[PDB]
Design a protein around this ligand. Structure first.
Ligand SMILES: CCCCOc1ccc[n+](CC(P(=O)(O)O)P(=O)(O)O)c1
Ligand SMILES: CCCCOc1ccc[n+](CC(P(=O)(O)O)P(=O)(O)O)c1
Ligand SMILES: [Mg+2]
Ligand SMILES: [Mg+2]
Ligand SMILES: [Mg+2]
Ligand SMILES: [Mg+2]
Ligand SMILES: [Mg+2]
Ligand SMILES: [Mg+2]
Lengths: 359, 358
């Protein structure tokens, strides 16, 4: 049922976008055809956690009628859902390029498709982002909440690109960060700290993945101030950090077939949860062998890093991590429940889709 | 004068953005420094015609206290920087898409020794996001914010649509299929003036000509006073001519004057020169073009250039330029009737465009 509606609104949105292109942007059938495939490939095939969370929060805050309100709020919630899913699609298109990934959701990355050049793919990503603004303006033209909705969406979007900068520069000595001078990947790994890890993940993931679906659900249902926002943000940040930790762990240990995408973290010398957690507790010997093997495409070097992780009991650390998180989450959810029972339930439901995801 | 204050608002915007990053986004001094340099390198060193136009339109319209003049002109500077940052964003990504080497006498952003191509794509995105951040900050309390951001975003989308038209213009559109690789076009049957005019209207005309005019009008609280049909006609015309000029210069202007290395021939681009040549060429000439276009090879590039010079493209260009100046004049007069001050600012814009040696 939630999926049923969400996919009707996908049709509505696509229809509005591609037709507008044909009618007002002189677009030929072939390019409308290209863009329809692009849109389907890039936006569809995920679990839609972000999109569906907007619907669920809206519905939960509805009680605060001929049903006309319900029709309206839930349809606005579906559109906001797609705004975040299209924002996500944009990020993944560009991120697969930045990360030199090969596949995504069991398909080749968009930029890796035979008839998609890297240059078009960059622009297709840009198109994805612009469609978020185009759909909002079409559907929310007459809504009092439009300006606030767009202000917040835009803030989070900026936040996410700021986090991406943290991610993409995390393997380079920041003191030597300088446009005019080339610099290799870090050799001492001095900045692969848990502190620098939490900052990357808070900004690149937590805001758009957890805070924004919640905020949008609250905006469309006109209930944003009914909620302790300090507690709501604590929750989003924590759940968002945990989600990315899971993403990192899965990159290394989850078989590609379940994962859908091949893991690039070790080869990209990424500042992952695994690397920072290993380096903090490792012996000098272990640090040496890590440094000898990280950040190379070589297959046995990557298999050494995996053994080192297993030998250092990182799966054990993860279990302990997960348990600390779940306890914090539970405590914050009850704090929410006191004056926002409906919302706390939608947050519980979001947690259900996150906690111990086999994904 | 307009230049001095425009640069004063730049420092104000820069200080707001970088300070916000340190205070609210947990940014370290090292990355702030990288971002300051990025912002300077990508946003400064051009002519600022887009930005300066907003100020000039704003000033031309403040009749049709003195704190209002200070506020309207400050608002016009911020809008100017919005379009300049939007442009910076475009040029960062465009240089990557186009495989360009220099821009404004320096390496393109993504060619800087300490800029990875991956970071460059993202820096481009930061550039776009800064347009929104600056508007939200300076115009928070301004009744025109929603309308401003709506038109801004629409022009932004229009431009990315034109970029698609540009980047897919050398591929047979009948065989556009994500699942199947295709080489560049070999018959060039889609290199038409028609197809050319569409690329150019969308990729350049809207953000380069219409957006600065619109923004100047918005901050002047004077948008409904002008004929928008006529204003758009001018913008599209002025915008097409500007791009034609950009195309010609790519091929015939010494890099030193331009600041950049021409990639149009190499990238098999649907340039004004290409479509204009192909439309008038003999079959023998078309053949020579076909064997020489879209290749990095030095001598093939210089074959294409000679083919252009021999086909009197420079006469075609003079004639087109004349026809444009003719259509432009008439539209400005029509605009001058009900909107005298706006027409003047449009005429000043045309002055910065007509026969530019840029
Ligand atoms: C312009 C902002 C782009 C933000 O991109 C992101 C943010 C968060 C997550 N991802 C995709 C992740 P994925 O590639 O799916 O493993 P990762 O590259 O972070 O591991 C991409
Ligand atoms: C996402 C939209 C990107 C638009 O990029 C553009 C649009 C218009 C002009 N330019 C730069 C031009 P330039 O590279 O300066 O000669 P060109 O690449 O069109 O020849 C770049
Ligand atoms: Mg990735
Ligand atoms: Mg990434
Ligand atoms: Mg990952
Ligand atoms: Mg270019
Ligand atoms: Mg280009
Ligand atoms: Mg050019």
């Amino acid at each position: 049922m939630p999926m049923q509606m969400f996919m009707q609104v996908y049709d509505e949105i696509q229809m509005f976008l591609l037709e507008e292109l044909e009618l007002k942007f002189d677009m030929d059938p072939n390019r409308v055809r290209y863009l329809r495939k692009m849109m389907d490939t890039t936006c569809l095939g995920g679990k839609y956690n972000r999109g569906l969370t907007v619907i669920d929060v809206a519905e939960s805050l509805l009680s605060l009628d001929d049903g006309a309100r319900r029709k309206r709020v839930l349809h606005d919630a579906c559109v906001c859902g797609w705004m975040i899913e299209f924002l996500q699609a944009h990020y993944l298109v560009e991120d697969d390029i930045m990360d030199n990934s090969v596949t995504r959701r069991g398909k080749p990355c968009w930029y890796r498709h035979p008839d998609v050049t890297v240059q078009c793919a960059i622009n297709d990503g840009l198109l994805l982002k612009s469609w978020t603004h185009m759909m909002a303006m079409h559907f929310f033209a007459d809504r009092p909440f439009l300006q606030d909705l767009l202000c917040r969406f835009n803030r989070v979007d900026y936040t996410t690109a700021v986090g991406q900068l943290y991610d993409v520069t995390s393997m380079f000595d920041s003191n030597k960060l300088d446009p005019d001078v080339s610099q290799p990947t870090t050799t001492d790994f001095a900045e692969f700290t848990l502190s620098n890890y939490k900052r990357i993940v808070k900004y690149k993931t937590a805001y758009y993945t957890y805070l924004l679906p919640l905020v949008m659900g609250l905006i469309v249902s006109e209930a944003l101030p009914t909620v302790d926002m300090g507690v709501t943000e604590e929750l989003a940040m924590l759940m968002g950090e945990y989600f990315q930790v899971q993403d990192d762990v899965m990159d290394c240990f989850t078989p590609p077939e379940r994962l859908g995408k091949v893991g690039t973290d070790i080869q990209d010398a990424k500042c992952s949860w695994l690397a920072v957690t290993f380096l903090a507790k490792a012996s000098s010997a272990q640090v040496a062998e890590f440094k000898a093997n990280y950040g190379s495409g070589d297959s046995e070097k990557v298999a050494t890093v995996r053994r080192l992780y297993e030998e250092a009991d990182l799966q054990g650390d993860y279990v302990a991590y997960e348990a600390a998180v779940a306890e914090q989450v539970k405590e914050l959810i009850e704090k929410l429940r006191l004056c926002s029972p409906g919302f706390a339930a939608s947050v519980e439901t979001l947690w259900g889709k996150t906690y111990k995801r086999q994904k």
